[PDB]
Design an enzyme around this catalytic site. Structure first.
Site, mmCIF file in Angstrom:
data_model
loop_
_atom_site.group_PDB
_atom_site.id
_atom_site.type_symbol
_atom_site.label_atom_id
_atom_site.label_comp_id
_atom_site.label_asym_id
_atom_site.label_seq_id
_atom_site.Cartn_x
_atom_site.Cartn_y
_atom_site.Cartn_z
ATOM 1 N N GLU D 249 -4.179 -6.226 7.860
ATOM 2 C CA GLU D 249 -3.199 -5.695 6.948
ATOM 3 C C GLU D 249 -2.364 -6.513 6.006
ATOM 4 O OE1 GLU D 249 -0.161 -2.264 7.966
ATOM 5 O OE2 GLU D 249 0.466 -2.969 6.000
ATOM 6 N N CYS D 283 4.881 -3.799 1.423
ATOM 7 C CA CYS D 283 3.392 -4.053 0.994
ATOM 8 C C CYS D 283 2.898 -3.100 0.254
ATOM 9 C CB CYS D 283 2.322 -4.109 2.371
ATOM 10 S SG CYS D 283 2.310 -2.836 3.168
#
Lengths: 477, 477, 477, 477
Positions: D249, D283
């Site tokens: 990720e 993010c």
């Protein structure tokens, strides 16, 4: 040319033991064209005995081998599409182009269910005790008794038969007596494809006597019925009396909601074309047109022009887009529906009368200013008649669409995501089509709610009524 | 102390409008211990109106919020396990240790279904036209009418109620009149946990009058029944007459197959202990013991010794492992079963007579050399009686296990993988347990086949009868 | 007759821009039989540009239309099975009967994946806010670069290609240079079936240069590799350096556990026949035979007799059951493995030497009394050599079977359910076959663990590496 | 008060063997507040040995017992939410209200995964041979090495840990050194809840040295990483070199599409509030605002007013809605981003400068007229800065949103179903939110595509990276 129809018992096409037959007439002329065998109790005994043996053999055939046999039957159906379509048109009345579409889509239905039979998956559950294994296995329920109507003689048989064969069950169907030839041709393809004797059976005769004997018979394990709601209630009560698993697909009353932001031209082309498919003799035919008052008048004019553009005549003759009604009882129902609409103050915009004096030809009918108490807005007309009523708020249209106990199909036309989300949540239907006509695919579930019955004939859910769930727990010691 | 039971209508515990009550007696003494309200038609009208409103509110609550409310009810049930168990023992007769196990497992059932309600997943189907979206959505069916027996007053209510609440449906249950207190305590925990008024309802009275009115009522959309096969056939026929979705859990006749390579000590401990659980008044109680002839005699002696080790007495008294039968009709059935076995030539190895003169106490009974025509081998005894019959070949045992129309549960004991694989394929039961007693978990499907009904009360399949499948196709233009 | 092989770029079979070629030799004679184009960087640029366009077109074709095109390619493969098999035998060395089985099973693989592509289902999640819709959609990842070995030139390409096409991805594969003709024939069938230009591509040349350029190229989104573990580690590191999704199928070291209660004759027929399939050059070939000491000696004699019954010769000649090894490097490895076994004290029961002086023929070899430090018990031999070692307790056999870092396949032979349950839980393999040889079906997952790689090439799990999961939440306002 | 942080090895909180520590500073003041142990190679050896033993014990605990232990840890986390939030605010800088939301949502994540662990279902495949059983079983992969960033110290650890524990794997995580206290408090709750020693481990030190040793270690079977793309590429290459299963990720660059028919007020409230959550150090933070030219100017004014309404100060002080940046490197990046925007001709509408001289406080920044070559539109800023650029056609906005190699999150605002359908099909993101801010629930998949990594941390897909798929076929003979 139209051929006579026999019974299919234990892999052989045979006459009834008593030799009795039932005449078959062409709905477009009223003249006899053939006859079909009339089975009695003795023939049902042989069919039930063969069904028990067919279930034993078919359940032992691996799923990949059953799929291969099923796909070979689909190829034969597709090869013989023209011949089957001609038989369907002569006995049922729909145009030859519509009959061909039904036969070709039947082959597509068989192929999807053949592959679905190889994906009947069991489950392994995380055990409470690691020394034991917990599994959920799926097995065929057993012999199946089926009853199908005349609206789609091949398509309404092919969905029940494909699901039964994909799970490993045997299948004994009473096809409609008024349209016997095309269902018999569909089952002939499965016989030619190599389906073992007794796995499939076909009978005709008195519908009440046949259903009263097959449903309580100990050989039958599952009953599936498609037809009218009053008849379905009789057979569902009989199935419950003997604790037989049952599924019901009954009549519907499909509402159409044309919102303020709808594309009027698209709504007329989609809902108007879906209205007069099979001369409106479809369980999902759009019936109650709820059109927003801002564009109601424009919608009505376009729908009337679309109805007047239909060519009414014999289904075999080229250029025909609306054939004759399947039986004279539909002619009487059409006259009663139009007559009641006139009495309650509704306006007949177009059609509304019988065409000619021979056959079952009725003109496409559009009715406007329909009150809520009119028969067309409460009872399923099952014909080429559309009823239009206006509304102001979308909540009022939704409330009207949910008023009747029929829960089969619905239609809508809108552009905003909020309207789509609201109609998906609120409409009490088993199927909803927005901005397009109905496109029933084998992979999509097909079924209704409330008085339209229960159970699905599409998607993976179509195999559940033919399967039994077994919990197995084995302690390893 | 035993308390009186009222009706739960619209969130309030109230008496019947007429004030009528039904006496509740202790099965171990025969003396009255309390009373329960007897609802009439007028009270059912208020319950049905509240059920419609409860469905509207509960279907709008998000699944994660419904799960949180359900898990709080499970905590309250677990906190009140001792009090609920004492009420169950006094009115039903099972020992206090067994009653506590049932209540604690009910809380475990609620927690599993609360999480399962958050995983009711729709489907997105690859479209035939890329400009349109095809989805399959799941929605609650609507108000549910339930009917439960006295064998497990809390557990048999908790499975229907948990599945209905997890899907968003409302729930109106007629609990058994002979054991009203413990089902009322279970529903009181859900009320205290914050379930909105009208979402849950509880009634008592005449079972025939209540079922005859709720099933045809237009408010009710789904019917679920657990009980005897003859009564289930009546209610399934009525549900079919009005096209109401129905599920049936009926009586079973569980066979036990003890193979040649079985562990005899394990089979006696597992099947013997499962036989006398709840004094054999369980729908999955092992009844027909088919033991291989090579170890049949050793099995019979060990089973007799296990039965003689049971302590019969009041369920409240410590050390009791077999309580009184729930009602005097079970005493008459036990005497009739033993008397018929003597007539047909079977041997009574132990027990077979009433203990004392007050209560419903019957001795644990083991019968050997049972012929196939004996009543115990054809009709469900529903009591603490085991019937033993020998066999030589495993195919003969399988054929006998499939002879009766009952398809609920089965048991086996074997060591080889081939035997396990063969019994999994061939036994016509909804549940199979091998080398262990029955361990019905909420995650495992629970249901029967043939005359045992249809539908599952465990696993993800337990939510399907309470859900409607809707196909949605939206054309993006 | 053997034909030359060209590159497939943008729907056209073309030579390399530089005109370079690589000679192809027959492994059974050592003589040249043809040549294959040697692509450079410039040809890879055209292939990558065509792959991007092919992904755009193929992702827009509906799943049912992609399935129809895929099934037409499967029919062409089945029609041309004899021709493709002859090309495979001449270039790879396996017998003609084995080559035909591989080609026919490749068509079966295509048909299963074509139907699986229509069942790539999204999900609808119960929303936390009822005013919003939460969905999970599945989409093709994009262009795929593939690398395949020579062991199964058609089968190892067909699994990667079928999964890529069923999801809508484009596919560019570097087929092995030593066996170029049969992979080219498989891709020719897809071109003839109507796969659009650029959706499929085929290249040959220097494996290191091609992989070093395709993997980091921005057009490539997914990399899939089948081959040796050392090479797979190089390409997996390169894929990780550029954050490319990757799947690896690497070499394995398959143990065979023959328990005390095993059927010795069945174990010899199943494991012995699976040992010498494709002359042992299979990633799942049974290698480490752990046989219980009570029946070890009888097992060894029967395995030796089975190996001596094999006919070694040219694969084109009828009656041949063991063909030549694919390349001379396998001959050197076979000699090194047998030589090391002699040094460590193992006994050569049969075979162990090169047959003749022309070709790559090696005798089937059985080695007994193999110590744990022998090379055959630590490194994958990839040849027609079996190693036998005894054991006393089943826990000792399981510990040995889990000692190596290879986790691809395992085999067992036993009769008790406890042994089956124990081996299922404890063996660290991706595939386990008990009481039968390996039967890899398209519906069963195919993959390994630990140093054998990750990812599956069968079942519904085979489509996940080619799909991207997207969460969509739309608030309706 | 802020406490020192130790390592968690084998169930004990211990110091490093060498006694080395790393200072922890408050980002809002720049002053030391505590210290954390600095583990060396020797401590990693003990952690790896304990991880192997923890996997052995945890994989043998039944799923329902692992769920019960996990839910008890969630209750402890919820009980200690205030204390954990205070530690998070002091070491990371986010406001106390945001820290409390993260901790409470972490407990919600644990509860969902605990129930998901009980639904790791195997499969039973319809066999090709009816005498054999084909099953697909799921097992834990093994010990897991994890690496987490400082943005969400508790939430980014809890997702990896919950998935590992639900499948039965052991878990060894290197938490960020700059925010060590709150991850240590989360793991302390699992220790207090009864997680066995060695199942969970926590280390701190030099990130490069720890990752270089754990990833190649034979004990570790699965690697999971969350952080920056350049670091993820290094660890993914190392994992590929040793054939370790990995999930990544990485950073994203979230576009926002405000269509012509969008609700401007809703878009400003949703996207503006999501922009400044955690001071933009997320993010999935909305970065590239593509606003239609017809309402671009109105959108810019409202966004500027929303940014000016934020209160910047210490996160512990009440009324603070924007805390200090986590580390001084974010201050330098913010200055570089704003400086480059001025050079390329963009306009600074508000903010753009450091606030004060102590701490890491930066003003909320809105930039308009951003060209495509600006650094803010190509590199992830990871701060409280929004960039606005206009567009005319929706196809132009979609093309810009897909230009960057980042594929993590996207946002849209529109009213028509056609726009929603088009954006769902075309946007290359792992997550899409329309008409609302991001609401990442445990049941929804969480992951990116292309350079944002692969693998999901939500939904049932979150368990697949921690599970191995095993095909088992047992022939019954």
């Amino acid at each position: 040319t139209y051929t006579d129809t026999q019974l299919l018992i234990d892999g052989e096409w045979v006459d009834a033991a008593s030799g009795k037959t039932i005449d078959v007439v062409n709905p477009a002329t009223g003249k006899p064209i053939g006859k079909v065998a009339h089975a009695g109790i003795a023939d049902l005994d042989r069919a039930l005995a063969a069904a028990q043996r067919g279930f034993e053999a078919w359940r032992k055939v691996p799923a990949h081998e059953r799929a291969a046999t099923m796909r070979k039957a689909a190829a034969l159906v597709r090869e013989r599409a023209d011949t089957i379509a001609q038989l369907m048109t002569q006995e049922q009345g729909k145009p030859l182009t519509e009959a061909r579409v039904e036969v070709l889509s039947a082959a597509d239905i068989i192929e999807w269910f053949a592959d679905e039979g190889r994906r009947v998956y069991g489950r392994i559950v995380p055990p409470r005790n690691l020394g034991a294994q917990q599994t959920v296995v799926k097995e065929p329920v057993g012999p199946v008794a089926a009853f199908t109507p005349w609206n789609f003689p091949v398509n309404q048989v092919v969905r029940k038969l494909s699901a039964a064969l994909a799970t490993g069950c045997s299948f004994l169907v009473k096809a409609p007596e008024e349209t016997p030839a095309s269902p018999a041709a569909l089952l002939r393809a499965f016989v030619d494809a190599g389906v073992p004797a007794g796995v499939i059976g076909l009978v005709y005769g008195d519908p009440a006597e046949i259903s009263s004997y097959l449903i309580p018979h100990p050989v039958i394990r599952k009953v599936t019925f498609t037809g009218s709601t009053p008849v379905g209630k009789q057979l569902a009560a009989l199935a419950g009396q003997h604790m037989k698993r049952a599924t019901m697909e009954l009549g519907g009353h499909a509402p159409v909601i044309v919102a303020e932001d709808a594309d009027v031209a698209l709504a007329v082309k989609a809902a108007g074309g879906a209205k007069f498919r099979n001369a409106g003799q479809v369980c999902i035919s759009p019936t109650r047109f709820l059109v927003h008052n801002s564009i109601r008048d424009e919608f009505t004019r376009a729908l009337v022009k679309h109805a007047e553009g239909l060519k009414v005549g014999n289904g075999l003759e080229e250029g025909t887009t609306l054939g004759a009604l399947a039986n004279p009882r539909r002619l009487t129902a059409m006259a009663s529906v139009v007559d009641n609409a006139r009495k309650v103050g509704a306006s007949i915009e177009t059609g509304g009368e019988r065409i000619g004096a021979e056959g079952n030809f009725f003109a496409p009918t559009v009715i406007a200013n329909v009150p809520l108490e009119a028969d067309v807005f409460n009872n399923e007309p099952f014909g080429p008649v559309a009823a239009i009523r206006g509304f102001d708020k979308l909540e009022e249209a939704i409330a009207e669409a949910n008023r009747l106990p029929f829960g089969l199909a619905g239609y809508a036309f809108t552009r905003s995501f909020a309207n789509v989300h609201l109609l998906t949540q609120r409409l009490e239907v088993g199927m909803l089509w927005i901005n397009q006509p109905a496109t029933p695919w084998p992979e999509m579930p097909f079924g209704g709610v409330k008085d339209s019955g229960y159970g699905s004939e599409g998607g993976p859910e179509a195999l559940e009524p033919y399967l039994v769930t077994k919990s197995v727990t084995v302690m390893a010691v």
